[PDB]
C-alpha cells in the first residue's frame, strides 16, 4: 500500500514512497549498514502511526 510501513530482518523499519510496475522504492529509517541483497521483507498491513 502507498506509504505503508514495512518490516526488515534487522529490526529496522521502512516506508514505500512510490510504486513502480515491477519494483518498489523504500527509504530506511534507522541504522542502514546491516542491509544486504537477499534479505526478507514483510508487510505490517498498517499505515504510519505514532
Amino acid at each position: 500500500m502507498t506509504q505503508e510501513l514495512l518490516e526488515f530482518p534487522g529490526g529496522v523499519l521502512g516506508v514505500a514512497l512510490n510504486l513502480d510496475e515491477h519494483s518498489v522504492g523504500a527509504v530506511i529509517l534507522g541504522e542502514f549498514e546491516k542491509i544486504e541483497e537477499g534479505q526478507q521483507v514483510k508487510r505490517t498491513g498498517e499505515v504510519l502511526s505514532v
Binding site: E33, K34, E36, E37
Partner: protein, 464 residues
C-alpha cells in the same frame, strides 16, 4: 571466494563476486598490479551494491596499471589502525604504516575506523573559561574549554601563523598528550613543523598523521577518520585530556564532491553531493567532551572564491560555538591580526559568567565600531568636513581604538625580527576603559601601530 574485475573508470572500480558469498559494506579488498615498473598492491573499500552480485569500490591508490581479470580477495573486516601507549613520537601515513622507521609496529592494539557517537545521557555542557595572552581574542570572543574553535577566512590571510602561535602558547603553558592532523597542506610546511617540534623538545608526546595534495581522494577523506579514532582511543582508556589540531577541513568536502561525480549520483546546487550534511554531522559529532574526559579542538576552514554564500562553510557554521573570522580589507589596511571585530561572536560571553565591566566595555566598543561603519558610506566621498564635530570625536576615537587592536605575536619572530608580547586581561580591560573614556586623544595615531602594552604605548608616544 575469488572475485573478478569487470569495469574500471577513474579511481572507481566495479567488481563481481560468486553468488554464494558477497562481502558486506566497508570491507577491505586486496588487488595487485603485475606490471614490472609500477608493481604495487591496492586496497579497495566497498561502496554500494548494483545487483547481479556486483559491487562498486573506491581505490585507495592511483589506479594506473590495472587490467581486467585480476583476482580479488577479501578480509571480512573494516579498515583497522594501530593504537597503543607508545604510538606518540612518530609520523604516519593514511594506512597507518610508519614512515621514519619502516616495519615498526604490527604488535599494538588494532581498532576499526567506523564507530558510533556516545549516547545522549553521557552529554554535558561545559563553561570553564580559557584565557590566552592575546588581547583581541580575550577581550571580544573568549575561548571556552571542552568546546570547539573555528577560524574562518579567505585565501592567504595568515591562518597558519595564528595556528602556530596558538599551538606554541598552549604547548608551552599546558602539557597533556597532543594530536596533530592535516588534509591539503604543503609538504614543505610539514617538514618545517617537524623541524620546529624537534627543536622545541615537545614532539615526544605529540602524535602526527597527515595527508597531502597529491593523493587520490580516498586518503584525503579517511585520514581524518583515522585521526579521530586515535584521539578517541587516547581519550577513553587513559582518561587523559587531549589537545586536537586539524587544518583545512574544507578540502575534505571537496574530496567527496569529486567521487560523487564518479559514482553517477544526481548533482545538487553548485555541483555538490546530493547528501553532504549527514557526512559533516557524523564527522563533527564524533568530537564531544564527556563528564570524565575533556577534549579541546580547533578547526581551520577555507572559503572558496571569497564568497560566503557557498554551503561548504555555511553547513559548518551550525556546529560551532566559538568563531573568529578574517577579512581581506583589514589585512590590506596593514594590521596583521586581521580579525573582524564586528562579525566575530561567541557563546560564553555573558554577565552570568563574566563580570559586568567586561560586558559593558565590549558593548561600548561594538557600538562605536558599528557607528563608524555606518558613517563610512558618507565619509568615503566628501570626507570629515561635512560631518559635525559631535561625530568627529567619535570618528577619531574609533580610528584610535581600532588601531589599538594590532599586536606583535611571537610567531612573526622570523619575519619582523622582534620578540613577542603577553598581556593579562586585567591590564587589557583597564587600558580599554581608559581609551573609551577619551583621555588618550592627544597622542598621535601612528604610535598605536604594532604596540605591546600601555607602558610601551606611552614610551613610543613620548619618544616621537
Amino acid at each position: 571466494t575469488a572475485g573478478r574485475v569487470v569495469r574500471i573508470t577513474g579511481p572507481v572500480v566495479d567488481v563481481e563476486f560468486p553468488r554464494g558469498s558477497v562481502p558486506e559494506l566497508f570491507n577491505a579488498l586486496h588487488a595487485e598490479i603485475t606490471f614490472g615498473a609500477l608493481a604495487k598492491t591496492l586496497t579497495l573499500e566497498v561502496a554500494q551494491h548494483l545487483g547481479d552480485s556486483l559491487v562498486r569500490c573506491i581505490s585507495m591508490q592511483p589506479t594506473d596499471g590495472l587490467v581486467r581479470g585480476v583476482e580479488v580477495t577479501d578480509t571480512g573486516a573494516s579498515i583497522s589502525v594501530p593504537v597503543g601507549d607508545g604510538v606518540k613520537g612518530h609520523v604516519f601515513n593514511a594506512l597507518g604504516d610508519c614512515l621514519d622507521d619502516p616495519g615498526y609496529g604490527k604488535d599494538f592494539e588494532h581498532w576499526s575506523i567506523h564507530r558510533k557517537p556516545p549516547a545522549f545521557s553521557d552529554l554535558e555542557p561545559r563553561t570553564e573559561m580559557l584565557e590566552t595572552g592575546l588581547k583581541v581574542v580575550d577581550l571580544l570572543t573568549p575561548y571556552v574549554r571542552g568546546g570547539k574553535i573555528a577560524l574562518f577566512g579567505g585565501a592567504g590571510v595568515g591562518k597558519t601563523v595564528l595556528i602556530q602561535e596558538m599551538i606554541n602558547r598552549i604547548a608551552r603553558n599546558f602539557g597533556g598528550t597532543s594530536v596533530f592532523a592535516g588534509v591539503g597542506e604543503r609538504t614543505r610546511e610539514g617538514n618545517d613543523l617537524w623541524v620546529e617540534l624537534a627543536d622545541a623538545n615537545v614532539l615526544k608526546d605529540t602524535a602526527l598523521v597527515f595527508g597531502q595534495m597529491d593523493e587520490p581522494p580516498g586518503t584525503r577523506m579517511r585520514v581524518a577518520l583515522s585521526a579521530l579514532t586515535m584521539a578517541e582511543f587516547f581519550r577513553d582508556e587513559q582518561g587523559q585530556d587531549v589537545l586536537l589540531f586539524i587544518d583545512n577541513i574544507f578540502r575534505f568536502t571537496q574530496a567527496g564532491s569529486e567521487v560523487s561525480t564518479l559514482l553517477g549520483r544526481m548533482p545538487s546546487a553548485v555541483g555538490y553531493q546530493p547528501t553532504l550534511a549527514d557526512e559533516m554531522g557524523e564527522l563533527q559529532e564524533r568530537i564531544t567532551s564527556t563528564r570524565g574526559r575533556s577534549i579541546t579542538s580547533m578547526q581551520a576552514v577555507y572559503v572558496p572564491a571569497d564568497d560566503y554564500t557557498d554551503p561548504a562553510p555555511a553547513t559548518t557554521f551550525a556546529h560551532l560555538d566559538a568563531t573568529t573570522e578574517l577579512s581581506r580589507a583589514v589585512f590590506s589596511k596593514g594590521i596583521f591580526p586581521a580579525v573582524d571585530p564586528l562579525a566575530s561572536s561567541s557563546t560564553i560571553l555573558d554577565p552570568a559568567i563574566v563580570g559586568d565591566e567586561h560586558y559593558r566595555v565590549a558593548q561600548e566598543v561594538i557600538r562605536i565600531l558599528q557607528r563608524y561603519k555606518d558613517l563610512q558610506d558618507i565619509i568615503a566621498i566628501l570626507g570629515i568636513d561635512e560631518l559635525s564635530e559631535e561625530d568627529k570625536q567619535l570618528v577619531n576615537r574609533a580610528r584610535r581604538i581600532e588601531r589599538f587592536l594590532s599586536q606583535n605575536m611571537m610567531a612573526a619572530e622570523q619575519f619582523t625580527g622582534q620578540p613577542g608580547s603577553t598581556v593579562p586581561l586585567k591590564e587589557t580591560i583597564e587600558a580599554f576603559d581608559k581609551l573609551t573614556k577619551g583621555e588618550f586623544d592627544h597622542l598621535p595615531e601612528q604610535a598605536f601601530f604594532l604596540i605591546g602594552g600601555l607602558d610601551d604605548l606611552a614610551k613610543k608616544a613620548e619618544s616621537l
